[PDB]
């Protein structure tokens, strides 16, 4: 398509070195495969899907900007919804019909120009909804059981004790956390709000 454009005489000449085209596509196919693989290695680490908990009092710790918003058509957290709105993609969806490119000629749409010359963009295996589900499972896991869900079975723990362990882990004795629990929870909640802004 790119080289000959349906010209028969060109196509017949192109065949003189057709092993070249096959090689170019082996290389591009290998790239496409890796892109789906990369996505799974980063997100699909835990195949146990934990559900987002009802929001309970976690000890003053507010996770509403990181957990999924159930009221939306796409259950993205408030932060995720912002991240998705800010990055702009070349087009919407992977279906472009012949009749759309034939009708909208005056439009000079770059996507149609690419397709008519043999350049095709393929869809991801994991959809944005699927990625959001992996993210939600990891957050649900962390809040409910800390790091234990990574190590093996998940073992439930009160959120504030999870934090106590995390403080001992940095060299600060846990009595500091409990004595200052309200302060720590408030600073945490404030910091998350600042990030979305």
């Amino acid at each position: 398509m790119y080289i000959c454009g349906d010209s028969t005489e060109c196509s017949n000449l192109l065949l003189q070195y057709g092993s070249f085209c096959t090689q170019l596509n082996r290389a591009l196919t290998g790239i496409a495969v890796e892109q789906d693989k990369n996505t799974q290695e980063v997100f699909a680490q835990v195949k146990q899907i934990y559900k987002t908990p009802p929001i309970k009092d976690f000890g003053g710790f507010n996770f509403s900007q990181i957990l999924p918003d159930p009221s939306k058509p796409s259950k993205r957290s408030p932060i995720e919804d912002l991240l998705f709105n800010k990055v702009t993609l070349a087009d919407a969806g992977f279906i472009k019909q012949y009749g759309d490119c034939l009708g909208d000629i005056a439009a000079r749409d770059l996507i149609c120009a690419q397709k008519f010359n043999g350049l095709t963009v393929l869809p991801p295996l994991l959809t944005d909804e699927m990625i959001a589900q992996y993210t939600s499972a990891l957050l649900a896991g962390t809040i409910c059981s800390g790091w234990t869900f990574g190590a093996g079975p998940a073992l439930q723990i009160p959120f504030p004790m999870q934090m106590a362990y995390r403080f001992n882990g940095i060299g600060v004795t846990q009595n500091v956390l409990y004595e200052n629990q309200k302060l720590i929870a408030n600073q945490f909640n404030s910091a998350i709000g600042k990030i979305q802004d």
């Binding site: 398509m1 835990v46 279906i95 397709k115 295996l125 809040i143 059981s145 869900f149 009160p158 004790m161």
Partner: protein
């Protein structure tokens, strides 16, 4: 205008194939044939596969959440892939789970270290 790919069970098993038309909506379709078994997805119009409402693990990926496999009187089927096992926990502010026993597990990790060394005489 393009958009064609073929989903194949091995040819040492069967010669049934499904054909995906990436730029066809199917809802005179710019397809080679129909013959029923027409399923529309975000990745294109898939002709020659039965849609199944059960989720399974992915075998041959198609795209946009859809995978296919050859299953029983065997034919090509398509389905939305499973993302993992459903699991659960019960967050509570006054209880903890503590291990009482353990197991020893040994796993294997495989990594390449080197490739073939070559030399070429251009003349």
């Amino acid at each position: 205008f393009g958009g064609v790919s073929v989903i194949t069970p091995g040819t040492n098993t069967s010669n049934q194939v499904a054909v995906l038309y990436q730029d066809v909506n199917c809802t005179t379709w710019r397809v080679y044939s129909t013959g029923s078994n027409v399923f529309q997805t975000r990745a294109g119009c898939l002709i020659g596969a039965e849609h199944v409402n059960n989720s399974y693990e992915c075998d041959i990926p198609i795209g946009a959440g859809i995978c296919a496999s050859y299953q029983t009187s065997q034919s090509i089927i398509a389905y939305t892939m499973s993302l993992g096992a459903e699991n659960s926990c019960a967050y509570s502010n006054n209880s903890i789970a503590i291990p009482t026993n353990f197991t020893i597990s040994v796993t294997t990790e495989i990594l390449p270290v080197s490739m073939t060394k070559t030399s070429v005489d251009c003349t």
